[PDB]
């Protein structure tokens, strides 16, 4: 009885693979072979933000492109002003094993979570704990706001969840993965999202329905980071096999691979520039690499951290980049 | 305006300095063990969908915080990375039960990790009385899992406890050397293993932890002053 279903899965997979190969007539490399490159790219450190006591796991820019929130494992959330390096807020957490943070698009709330399996929500404009969300059975690894009353979370119990905050009830659940979900990203229209896990695959989910649209494979090991293209029709991922890859939603297959023969360490973070022409990646060497997206050439290096780079971010106007690592410092590059 | 912002920033900095002064003086420990081990009994011998638990105690006016893991899954190659800067790892093993190969494999995987290769381990071999009763019963053999035990002799430089039978000493020493071989085989020269024999009625484990942490901090001091 089980063998028949396994066979059926086999023929279905073969049909999908054949139909997918039937559409690949050219490559991205052969179509961009006749464009002028970007050249060499220099960036310089403008600010250094000091004040944390231990590792830094997460960051998130505000929508005004001025204010930051950062999370460390001494048990602190700090909210910074970046033009003047002032401190605006410092929030102590009840559990110190925090792993993610987010900033509300209206600027009124922040959120965090970690090894306690609870997502906590703080109100900034009254700082007291506004609410706590409980119901996952594994550590919380990511979270992003949709508006001031909805939130989407990913856990290390192989499921995603969508929560309504005022009632405090888990209103939708997204299942289908087989390993720890490690990252999320919201589409620019905020009606779809992609997730990636430790089974080496990525999935596209419809928010309004609760069902998976598409599955993407091709990596060799666990996937740590994920991001959308500014257009909303493609996305890029990074893994522990020391490789980045670019996939397309409409053609339903991989488009490009960014890798080098002297890089044998995993990738912890990815991000796009404002026009989508550069791709920035944070590494376990100790530093960051800047790639050309349309020709797969390495264009620049950002160096200057003394430990493992943990997180990156680019503002909503494209003016600056912010990087944080395990040496307890945040740096702003321009 | 600007003056109010600078004033608020300075007040926050004062509070942060106060917090750091007390953060730097506490010792954090991570506790690991399997279900068949008596780990909860050990944590219950200390006097001062939830994911993690903490226990606080004090010895000689020194503060210890010890952490234990609650509702997680089997996979642990992602959340272990959170514990790269703890002072020590306390590893509990049930020495009367076999499942010893699983314990040895766990210890070998913990010892050689990339983000945990500067952290020292205090090893607790639990349930000594059960092992003694099993050895004296004579209905079970150790050559069924570790054949090399057939050709092992207790060293002449041993210091047995007064009153123990030779057989119990031989079994004890073989089992301990099994873990010490893994500890010394790779190594780094930058971290050490401290083994102890324990039961469920001992009132000496807090003192043992105190002493080993004293030695760990002394070694780190000697390394930072460039003397060893």
């Amino acid at each position, epitope marked *: 009885e089980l063998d028949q279903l396994r066979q059926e899965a086999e023929q279905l997979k073969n049909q999908i693979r054949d139909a997918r190969k039937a559409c690949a007539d050219a490559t991205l490399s052969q179509i961009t072979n006749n464009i002028d490159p970007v050249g060499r790219i220099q960036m310089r450190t403008r600010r250094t933000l000091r004040g944390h006591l231990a590792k830094i796991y997460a960051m998130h820019w505000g929508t005004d492109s001025r204010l930051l929130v950062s999370a460390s494992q001494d048990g602190k959330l700090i909210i910074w002003d970046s033009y003047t390096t002032n401190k605006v807020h410092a929030i102590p957490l009840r559990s110190s094993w925090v792993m993610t943070c987010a900033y509300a698009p209206s600027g009124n709330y922040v959120a965090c979570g970690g090894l306690d399996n609870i997502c906590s929500i703080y109100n900034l404009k009254t700082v007291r704990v506004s609410r706590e969300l409980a119901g996952h059975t594994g550590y919380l690894s990511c979270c992003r706001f949709l508006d001031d009353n909805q939130i989407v979370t990913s856990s290390g119990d192989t499921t995603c969840a969508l929560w309504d905050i005022e009632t405090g009830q888990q209103t939708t659940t997204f299942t289908g993965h*087989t*390993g720890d979900v490690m990252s999320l990203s919201l589409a620019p229209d905020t009606r779809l999202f992609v997730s990636g896990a*430790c*089974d*080496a695959s990525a999935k596209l989910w419809d928010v309004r329905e609760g069902m998976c649209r598409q599955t993407f*494979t*091709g990596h*060799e*090991s*666990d996937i740590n980071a994920i991001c959308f293209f500014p257009n909303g029709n493609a996305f890029a991922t990074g893994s*522990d*096999d020391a490789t980045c890859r670019l996939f397309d939603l409409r053609a339903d297959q991989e488009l490009m691979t960014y890798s080098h023969d002297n890089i*044998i360490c*995993g990738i912890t973070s990815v991000s796009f520039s404002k026009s989508g022409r550069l791709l920035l990646a944070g590494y376990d060497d100790f530093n960051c690499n800047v790639w050309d997206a349309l020709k797969a050439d390495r264009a620049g290096v950002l160096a200057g951290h003394d430990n493992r780079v943990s997180c990156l971010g680019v503002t909503d106007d494209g003016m600056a980049v912010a990087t944080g690592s395990w040496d307890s410092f945040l740096k702003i590059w321009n | 305006e600007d003056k109010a912002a600078v004033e608020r920033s300075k007040m926050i900095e004062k509070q942060l300095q106060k917090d750091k002064q007390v953060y730097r003086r506490t010792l954090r420990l991570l506790l690991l063990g399997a279900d068949n081990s008596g780990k909860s009994t050990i944590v219950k011998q200390m006097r001062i969908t939830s994911g993690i638990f903490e226990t606080k105690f004090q010895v000689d006016k020194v503060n210890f915080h010890m952490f234990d893991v609650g509702a997680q*899954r*089997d*996979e*642990r*190659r992602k959340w272990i990375q959170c514990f790269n800067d703890v002072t020590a790892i306390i590893f509990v093993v049930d020495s009367s039960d076999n499942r010893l*190969q*699983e314990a040895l*494999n766990d210890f*070998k*995987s913990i010892w*050689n*990790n*990339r983000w945990l290769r500067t952290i020292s381990v205090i090893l607790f071999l639990n349930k000594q009385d059960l092992l003694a009763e099993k050895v004296l019963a004579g209905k079970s053999k150790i050559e*069924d*899992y*570790f*054949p*090399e035990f057939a050709r092992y002799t207790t060293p002449e430089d041993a210091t047995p406890e007064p009153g123990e039978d030779p057989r119990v000493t031989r079994a004890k020493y073989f089992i301990r050397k099994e873990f010490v071989d893994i500890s010394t085989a*790779s190594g780094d020269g930058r971290h050490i293993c401290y083994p102890h024999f324990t039961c469920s009625v001992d009132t000496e484990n807090a003192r043992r932890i105190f002493n080993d942490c004293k030695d760990i901090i002394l070694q780190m001091n000697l390394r930072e002053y460039n003397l060893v």
Partner: nanobody, 128 residues
Framework: QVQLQESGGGLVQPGGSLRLSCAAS????????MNWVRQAPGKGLEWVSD????????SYTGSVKGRFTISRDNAKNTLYLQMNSLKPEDTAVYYC?????????????????????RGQGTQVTVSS
């Protein structure tokens, strides 16, 4: 797509011999370590044997030393286990596994839950 496929298995008399093979596809076979694991009727998952990336280092459990041998083939992307002098206490389902990351010394999680880089397994029975 990572894929592992095992072959061999069957029913043998006590004191017999067998040779299991495994074919791997979808990754650089020569960058990883390889593992043989087994599960018995009514028990959990148990580690059986270990081999490194260049074939230099080998490792077995105490209860199989002197009877089982592990071997590697990088050009053909194949792993082999040779079992001699079978006992009735070897009746089990065998699986092949590889470590989660390349160029590394520590190993994977031997877990009942869905470990993504394990095969379906083959059945071996030793009885008369």
């Amino acid at each position: 797509q990572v894929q592992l496929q095992e072959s061999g298995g069957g029913l043998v008399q006590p004191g017999g011999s067998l040779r299991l093979s495994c074919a791997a596809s979808g990754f650089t076979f020569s960058n990883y370590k390889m593992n043989w694991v087994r599960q018995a009727p009514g028990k959990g998952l148990e580690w059986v044997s270990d081999i490194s990336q260049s074939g230099a280092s080998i490792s077995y459990t105490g209860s199989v030393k002197g009877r089982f041998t592990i071997s590697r083939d990088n050009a053909k992307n194949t792993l082999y286990l040779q079992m001699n002098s079978l006992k009735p206490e070897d009746t089990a389902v065998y699986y092949c596994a590889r470590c989660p990351a390349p160029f590394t010394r520590d190993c994977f999680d031997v877990t009942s839950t869905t470990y993504a880089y394990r095969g379906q397994g083959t059945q071996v029975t030793v009885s008369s």
